[PDB]
From a paper:
Although physiological activation of the MAPK pathway is RAS dependent, the interaction between RAS and the catalytic subunit of PI3Kα, p110α, serves as an amplifier but not a primary activator of this pathway, and is less important in normal cellular regulation than it is in cancer. Mutational studies have identified key residues, Thr208 and Lys227, within the RBD region of p110α, that facilitate interaction with RAS upon receptor tyrosine kinase-driven recruitment of PI3Kα to the plasma membrane. By mass-spectrometry-based chemoproteomics we detected 21 cysteines on p110α, including Cys242, which is exclusive to p110α, in the RBD and proximal to Thr208 and Lys227. We developed small molecules that covalently ligate Cys242, adjacent to the RAS binding interface of p110α, blocking its interaction with RAS proteins.
To understand how our covalent ligands for Cys242 blocked the interaction between RAS and p110α, we determined the X-ray co-crystal structure of VVD-442 covalently bound to the RBD of p110α at 2.83 Å resolution. The compound covalently bound to Cys242 in a hydrophobic groove between α-helices 3 and 4. The central sulfonamide formed a hydrogen bond with the terminal amide of Lys228, and the bromine formed a halogen bond (or σ-hole interaction) with a water positioned by Ser292. VVD-442 bound on the opposite side of β-strands 1 and 2 of the RBD, relative to the site of the primary interaction with RAS. Thus, we expect that the molecule does not block RAS-p110α binding through direct steric occlusion. Specifically, the positions of Arg230, Ser231 and Leu233 in the VVD-442 bound structure were incompatible with the switch I region of RAS observed in the p110α-RAS-glue complex. This model is consistent with experimental data showing that binding of VVD-442 to p110α disrupts the RAS-p110α interaction. VVD-699 and BBO-10203 are structurally distinct molecules, reflective of unique paths to discovery, leading to differing mechanisms by which they disrupt the RAS-PI3Kα interaction– VVD-699 binds adjacent to the RAS-p110α interface and stabilizes a conformation of the p110α RBD that is incompatible with RAS binding, whereas BBO-10203 induces a direct steric clash at the interface between RAS and p110α.
Numbering used by the authors: 157 to 298
The structure:
């Protein structure tokens, strides 16, 4: 069984039944966009890095990663194309986990469809996601 299938079995997304947001919830956002907080502990140093993005609620976990790249990288003054290219090279190496929990964003559903994210919006809290390598997760697998 592929590491993908094992992940998918073990860490199934906890989601709402449909991707449609009720207005009462959509209207808590700024123009449909959610403010989220991406944590990373990377490389050899394992320093606590932290980016705060503002993204459409309906983005897919990987598009969230993409904005994570854009944010970290903005001081490189890269061109659109130099950037998008790199984003295409990198996006797929990593996934999102809820900080401290064992809840993963392993599914191309919209972010606000995930129950964690929807709960945050309701409670008016910022989601705290954690960015990590696919290899990292495949290694942790029972
Ligand atoms: C393209 C690379 S380049 C030098 O122009 O060819 C630019 C747009 N991207 C990056 O520099 C980047 F995508 C490389 C990968 N990460 S990372 O900081 O090296 C990183 C390594 C390991 C983990 Br686990 C997580 C991350 C990471 C940290 C912070 C934000 C996003 C990520 Cl994926 C980011 C930058």
């Amino acid at each position: 069984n592929s590491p993908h299938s094992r992940a998918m079995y073990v860490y199934p997304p906890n989601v709402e039944s449909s991707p449609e947001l009720p207005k009462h919830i959509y209207n808590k956002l700024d123009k449909g966009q959610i403010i989220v907080v991406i944590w990373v502990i990377v490389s050899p140093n394992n320093d606590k890095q932290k980016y705060t993005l503002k993204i459409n609620h309906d983005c897919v976990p990987e598009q969230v990663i993409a904005e994570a790249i854009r944010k970290k990288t903005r001081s490189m003054l890269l061109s659109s194309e130099q950037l998008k290219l790199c984003v295409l090279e990198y996006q797929g190496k990593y996934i999102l986990k809820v900080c401290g929990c064992d809840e993963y964003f392993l599914e191309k559903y919209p972010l606000s469809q995930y129950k964690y994210i929807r709960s945050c919006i309701m409670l008016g809290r910022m989601p705290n996601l954690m960015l990590m390598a696919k290899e990292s997760l495949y290694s942790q697998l029972p």
